[PDB]
């Protein structure tokens with residue numbers, strides 16, 4: 001019943017967690033540079049179909065994700081959006097594409113994925129290139145807050161449930177640093193978080209890219225840990 005962690009998640013297995021009516025997160029674990037990390041994504045019911053946000057960080061994890069969705073939900077995943085270019089967001093796009101899923105990301109994410117040798121979503125999401133931009137995509141709104149964890153990071157809001165999926169631009173409350181900052185803009189990140197706070201003041205659940213969901217406090221906590229990481 002509690003939100004799952006690695007200690008319940010061997011690498012290769014996937015858990016789903018019901019967030020709200022028609023909204024689940026997915027949780028998987030992966031090894032990277034000799035350490036094991038959890039990571040989240042989102043699943044949103046879209047009538048008789050499902051919209052997937054982010055892969056489960058790897059090909060085998062993403063295959064396991066599709067199997068877990070069939071077991072627990074039983075509706076087809078028809079579209080997926082990746083919220084930035086890192087492997088915890090696009091690793092598994094090839095699996096999705098061979099399982100009938102149409103894969104999408106911004107042009108900025110597609111270019112960065114291609115340049116870095118990561119898997120590349122098929123379709124480009126226009127209308128998101130300026131900070132503060134928002135577009136509708138099925139049952140969600142996609143929002144580009146500005147550079148934060150990465151220059152391309154997108155945020156996803158589920159208006160029916162007031163669920164804010166921050167992706168890796170948002171950290172969990174227990175975080176002690178800003179995570180993997182390799183491609184981050186620590187100077188711009190607080191401004192981007194402030195844009196999220198201003199745009200989604202009615203969010204009830206906030207889901208970070210890694211770790212435990214909570215409420216709006218995750219946004220302020222993220223700004224706090226990023227400002228202190230920078231300093």
Ligand SMILES: C[C@@H](c1cccc2c(-c3ccc(CS(C)(=O)=O)c(F)c3)c(C(=O)O)[nH]c12)N1CC(CCN)OC1=O
Nearest residue numbers: 032037086087088168171175176177178179180182210
């Ligand atoms: C594949 C991805 C990656 C791999 C491994 C770990 C992470 C973390 C991470 C780290 C620590 C914490 C605990 S905490 C908030 O207290 O510090 C955390 F929650 C998340 C993140 C993230 O923060 O989103 N991304 C990671 N990658 C790869 C990459 C550059 C490759 N050239 O950059 C990146 O992010």
Ligand SMILES: [Zn+2]
Nearest residue numbers: 084086149168
């Ligand atoms: Zn990342």
Ligand SMILES: [Zn+2]
Nearest residue numbers: 088168209210
């Ligand atoms: Zn991440």
